[PDB]
Amino acid sequence: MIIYDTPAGPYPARVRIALAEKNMLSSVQFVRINLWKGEHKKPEFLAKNYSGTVPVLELDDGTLIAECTAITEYIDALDGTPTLTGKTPLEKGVIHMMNKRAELELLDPVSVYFHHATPGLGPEVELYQNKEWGLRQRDKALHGMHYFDTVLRERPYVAGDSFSMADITVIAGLIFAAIVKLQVPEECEALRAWYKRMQQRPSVKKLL
Amino acid sequence: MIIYDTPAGPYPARVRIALAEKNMLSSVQFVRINLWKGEHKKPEFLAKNYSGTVPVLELDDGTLIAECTAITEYIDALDGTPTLTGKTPLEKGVIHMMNKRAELELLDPVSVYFHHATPGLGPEVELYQNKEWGLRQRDKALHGMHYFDTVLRERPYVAGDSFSMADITVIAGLIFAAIVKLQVPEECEALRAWYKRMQQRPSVKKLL
Numbered sequence: 001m002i003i004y005d006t007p008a009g010p011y012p013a014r015v016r017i018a019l020a021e022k023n024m025l026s027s028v029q030f031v032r033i034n035l036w037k038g039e040h041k042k043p044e045f046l047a048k049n050y051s052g053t054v055p056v057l058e059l060d061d062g063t064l065i066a067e068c069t070a071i072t073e074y075i076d077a078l079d080g081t082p083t084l085t086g087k088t089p090l091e092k093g094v095i096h097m098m099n100k101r102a103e104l105e106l107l108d109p110v111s112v113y114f115h116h117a118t119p120g121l122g123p124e125v126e127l128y129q130n131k132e133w134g135l136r137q138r139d140k141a142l143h144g145m146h147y148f149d150t151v152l153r154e155r156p157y158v159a160g161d162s163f164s165m166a167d168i169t170v171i172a173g174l175i176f177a178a179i180v181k182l183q184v185p186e187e188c189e190a191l192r193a194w195y196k197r198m199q200q201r202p203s204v205k206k207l208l
Numbered sequence: 209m210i211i212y213d214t215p216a217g218p219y220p221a222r223v224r225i226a227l228a229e230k231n232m233l234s235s236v237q238f239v240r241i242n243l244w245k246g247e248h249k250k251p252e253f254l255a256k257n258y259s260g261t262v263p264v265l266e267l268d269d270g271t272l273i274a275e276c277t278a279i280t281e282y283i284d285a286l287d288g289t290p291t292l293t294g295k296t297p298l299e300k301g302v303i304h305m306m307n308k309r310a311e312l313e314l315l316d317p318v319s320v321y322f323h324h325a326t327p328g329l330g331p332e333v334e335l336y337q338n339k340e341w342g343l344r345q346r347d348k349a350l351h352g353m354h355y356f357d358t359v360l361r362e363r364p365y366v367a368g369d370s371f372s373m374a375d376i377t378v379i380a381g382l383i384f385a386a387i388v389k390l391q392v393p394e395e396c397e398a399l400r401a402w403y404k405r406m407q408q409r410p411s412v413k414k415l416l
């Protein structure tokens with residue numbers, strides 16, 4: 001398997017964490033895409049991924065699987081025992097809900113804030129920027145932190161009693177938040193504690 | 209099971225189609241949320257869904273499953289034989305990729321265009337609007353149509369040889385597109401043909 005990514009990207013982190021979690025890092029050849037050079041916006045990479053983002057998985061037969069959620073679903077089901085994406089119908093549903101909600105309310109908006117209301121990847125890569133939109137996404141992400149704090153006052157992991165794809169998305173959300181110095185509010189005690197715990201997981205600790 | 213939705217909403221259509229597809233419509237009590245009155249933005253509905261959108265599934269024990277993808281994953285796995293979200297690892301991966309890509313490149317941007325660069329749900333509901341962002345999402349959606357046309361010149365359904373959650377997302381994308389009169393380009397022959405076929409499916413035909 002090939003993963004096209006940048007090693008320190010927060011979305012890439014979602015797949016790298018999931019790979020470690022599945023003891024599969026050794027099954028993967030990582031190929032560097034230089035986002036700083038806008039390599040992801042040029043025809044060669046766009047042929048690997050219409051949406052122009054990393055990571056993207058390429059299988060031995062050339063099948064391309066793009067999107068963190070889809071890659072995770074692929075690698076989680078491979079060894080026949082899913083430990084990230086759910087076994088029962090309720091688990092699959094709640095994990096996908098929380099995974100998507102973490103994208104919507106935390107990770108995606110931090111990333112839109114990076115690209116739109118900061119220099120981001122630089123003026124040659126960020127050809128269009130909407131600062132007003134980017135700033136509102138910053139605020140959305142802050143609300144997201146408060147939302148995930150309320151979740152974590154009631155359960156030990158984002159989707160319930162077990163570690164899942166959803167924790168990985170929030171972790172990636174907080175990694176991005178650190179990149180842009182969007183501070184987790186002091187009063188977000190449950191989110192802070194959970195994150196410290198997450199940073200103790202081998203998969204996460206090695207990466208950071 | 210309860211679904212909170214509005215009957216003619218394109219995102220709601222994704223779940224209603226999936227329910228029909230799984231022969232499960234009779235297992236569902238539909239409860240009306242009035243988006244035109246901004247009911248989805250008030251405290252009572254926000255307690256059902258932090259993200260403030262429809263549809264949302266509520267189980268007999270009060271468990272809430274939000275997000276079209278998550279609801280579909282839940283109901284597809286219920287009867288033990290998934291026909292929408294994939295059996296093999298490759299199927300799960302490709303279907304999730306295409307499902308997410310249809311959201312990203314077609315349905316979501318049409319919807320953002322509706323809410324931001326048209327009157328949308330009206331000036332009392334659409335309290336903030338970014339017309340410039342909304343118009344760029346319109347353009348993104350147009351590109352999406354061209355993208356899905358290229359996919360459908362090579363395979364009969366969005367994710368491959370079989371009907372899946374991914375077709376449902378594109379269908380919902382085109383339903384929304386019709387609402388806002390964003391015309392499918394003439395040269396998008398494969399997308400047009402596929403859509404006519406989709407409108408022949410009982411699940412889709414009844415809904416429209």
Ligand SMILES: N[C@@H](CCC(=O)N[C@@H](CS)C(=O)NCC(=O)O)C(=O)O
Pocket residue numbers: 009010011012035040052053054055066067068069111115121
């Ligand atoms: N797989 C992601 C998208 C990934 C993503 O936005 N990755 C970042 C890298 S951290 C990226 O490609 N940014 C490049 C850009 O926006 O120009 C998804 O789940 O939608």
Ligand SMILES: N[C@@H](CCC(=O)N[C@@H](CS)C(=O)NCC(=O)O)C(=O)O
Pocket residue numbers: 217218219220243248260261262263274275276277319323329
């Ligand atoms: N489940 C959807 C979101 C659903 C959605 O945007 N639904 C529309 C109804 S067609 C909505 O609630 N719009 C209300 C609004 O934006 O104010 C998702 O998959 O993210």
